[PDB]
Amyloid beta (A4) protein (Peptidase nexin-II, Alzheimer disease), isoform CRA_b (Homo sapiens), 392 residues
Amino acid sequence: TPDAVDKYLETPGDENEHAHFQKAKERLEAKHRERMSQVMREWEEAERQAKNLPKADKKAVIQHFQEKVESLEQEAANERQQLVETHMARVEAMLNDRRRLALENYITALQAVPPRPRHVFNMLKKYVRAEQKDRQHTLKHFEHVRMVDPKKAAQIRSQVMTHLRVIYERMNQSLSLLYNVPAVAEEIQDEVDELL
Amino acid sequence: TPDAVDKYLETPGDENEHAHFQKAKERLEAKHRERMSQVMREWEEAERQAKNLPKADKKAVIQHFQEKVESLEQEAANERQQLVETHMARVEAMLNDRRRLALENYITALQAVPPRPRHVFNMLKKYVRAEQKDRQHTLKHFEHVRMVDPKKAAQIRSQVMTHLRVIYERMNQSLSLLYNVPAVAEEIQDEVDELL
């Protein structure tokens, strides 16, 4: 019952996550090797048997396993891609809260009446950092559309490239925040471009 | 000059192989991360700059990097698939010699005038084993057509599924060899089916 994928998909948010993901891929792959060998041994028994038969039957037999194999190897390719895509999403969620928490701070510092320039930066590097870690991870996801099957792969790529463009704009929007507090801007500026 | 892929492709047959392959994937991936970050940092500088410009320019800029990224991530996906496919071939070569050497023996034993049944099996398990290890590895290759891009992926699958069918027939042909020496067949038979 609790299938490798079923389990993973049912125990989310996890703090240990990465473990689940590896335990997941490692456990699914194992089982796969099982069924795969079960079908391959099976295929032989079928050949040796039907051997003293017509080309029509021998051949037809081969067209059975050839197809049962293509059938499982596919479902298998999908279960994996199921794991990756879920995981990939759960990390995104994490990285996103981090992006959020750093910004709620950068805004916190930005608003202090005696705008301690030194602080703005402190809280901003943490924002720009997270944003960057997200930038990076979104890319990792893009590249993980390797098994590219339907147009789902092209659809995802578009969803990835799309969020990738947001990440940027939303940071530049966050950076435009300095203009409203035209002061800390100078003490921070030249330093800002350095991080960039 | 000696590109990660260039090097790998130029130092074959290797006995250490696996090392080359890992050193290869590890070194290509590293460099990739480099160019990728170079383009991502670059993209920002371009945004912050062109920011105080029209939607036409800002947007167009984004259409530059969006495309330069898709451009590199692809070439990158191809260089990798280049490594895998080469490696995958070189292993096949290896496993194939093993398939050969075991058969030259199984035939050697099969031909001894005083057909020592006990030996035929000894040399045959080694054949059927190799053949099986090949069976397995061909499958690993099939599943490694994950990045599926053009119809190259479908073309390869067909080449894989094709060799997969040969592996079988050629073993059953090798097994049919027992019939010509109708003797060792009985002492070996029931035992034969057990390995199967």
Q: What stands out?
A: DSSP finds six helices and no strands in chain A. The two ends of chain A are 51 Å apart (CA to CA).
